[PDB]
């Protein structure tokens, strides 16, 4: 059939970071395990991660795969809509994390017309951090294009994880910038050296964070990995 | 059948630069046309380019393809062995280019112990120049791995092309660095605004040139496109 198969085509390692929309036929298992990594072994027992993975797969979502469209995602970003999922298990969880979250939802979001995205972002720890700017730009475009009129979310709820080095460092280096612009930031006590961290950002702050995150490599990736 | 085909897999453009060994079953036509571009319309009538492309396909050669292993190379680098091909049409051509190349060949032949690569390097003008450091590193490894003992060629004869701006500029930005380290470098008179340029480098000068050429992006490519 294909005379280039089994004919020296793998002599050179070629690791490519290809971006795909969330695929409900392929991505569920790997997404569920990335959520387990994000929330950690204790909080994973407190969230229905199967339900959250299903929600993600019906939401604006971008994955990164190095082993083809058929393979597992090694990184994803998803913007889950708060108001449309206001009765979801994950919203139920977030309402109980801290009064700052429940107060924000009630007073800033339920109060009026402002829209809130629940950000789910995780990747295997060997994934390069320079994929993050193109990842956010593509997924933000998914929202803006579907909403039309260059609209966007007003606020973003980001859950992430940090660690004690014996000093605290970041699994996701972009969180350094998110923290700089966060309207609200708080963290749980460390457990097994890992800290659960919660940030509320407005859209201006999110965009500023991604701009400040840009490197020569992430700009290169944006030029080669983008919507039509 | 592949259920991920015709299922949203092209929503995001993903341009990747994959590196392959020279493929005699696929690459001949494109290599010959890249040789025509390299030598130009006048000198192409003075070289048997079919014979040269055949020599390239039997030599250490790396190509870059964006459209898969079955597609045409858009960039290649080849090190053709001088001594093994010392009666070839291409050596005959180089001997008559200029007394400065003929004198170098004589000094080499008479030495009896030095090895020289005939470097053939060309790419479509839309290819990004940052691919050049990983392209050279992979092809040099082809030589060193085959020979063992970290051995390498002593000298490299590079034919290239430059152009008159109406000032002289480079089709291959790496030539600016090669020129600074060249054992011998001379150029023919411009024809139709295009200048034929001839460089002889020793291995130390070639290594220094590639190191000077490295950028954040070319180093990124090296980390993701390399031998096993
Ligand atoms: Ca790349």
UniProtKB/Swiss-Prot annotation, chains A, B:
Entry annotated with the keyword RNA-binding: no
Gene Ontology MF term list: protein folding chaperone
Keyword Cytoplasm applies: yes
Post-translational note: Phosphorylated by the PHO85-PCL1 kinase complex.
Biological processes annotated in GO: protein export from nucleus; ribosomal large subunit export from nucleus
Pfam family, one: BCCIP
Keywords: Cytoplasm, Nucleus, Phosphoprotein, Protein transport, Transport
InterPro entries named in the record: BCP1_family (IPR025602)
Primary localisation category: cytoplasm
GO cellular component terms, semicolon-separated: cytoplasm; nucleus
Location relative to the cell: Cytoplasm; Nucleus
Function (record text): Involved in nuclear export of the lipid kinase MSS4 and of the 60S ribosomal subunit. May also play a role in directing MSS4 to the plasma membrane. Plays a role in actin cytoskeleton organization and vesicular transport.
Family: Belongs to the BCP1 family.
Additional remarks: Present with 4590 molecules/cell in log phase SD medium.
UniProt protein name: Protein BCP1
């Amino acid at each position: 059939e294909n005379e280039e198969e089994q004919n020296g085509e793998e002599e050179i390692v070629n690791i490519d970071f290809d971006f795909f929309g969330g695929n409900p036929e392929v991505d569920f298992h790997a997404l569920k395990n990335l959520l387990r990594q994000l929330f950690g072994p204790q909080e994973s027992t407190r969230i229905q991660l199967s339900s959250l993975a299903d929600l993600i797969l019906g939401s604006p979502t971008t994955t990164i795969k190095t082993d083809g469209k058929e393979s597992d995602p090694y990184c994803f970003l998803s913007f889950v809509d708060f108001k449309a999922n206001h009765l979801s298990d994950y919203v139920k969880y977030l309402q109980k994390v801290d009064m700052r979250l429940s107060t924000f939802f009630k007073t800033m979001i339920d109060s009026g017309n402002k829209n809130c995205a629940l950000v789910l972002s995780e990747r295997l720890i060997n994934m390069p951090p320079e994929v993050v700017p193109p990842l956010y730009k593509i997924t933000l475009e998914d929202v803006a294009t579907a909403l039309g009129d260059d609209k966007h979310y007003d606020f973003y709820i980001i859950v992430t994880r940090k660690y004690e080095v014996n000093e605290v460092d970041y699994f996701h280096e972009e969180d350094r910038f998110f923290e700089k612009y966060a309207k609200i930031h708080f963290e749980s006590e460390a457990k097994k050296g890992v800290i659960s961290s919660y940030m509320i950002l407005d859209h201006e702050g999110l965009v500023k964070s991604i701009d400040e995150l840009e490197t020569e490599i992430s700009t290169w990736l944006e030029h080669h990995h983008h919507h039509h």
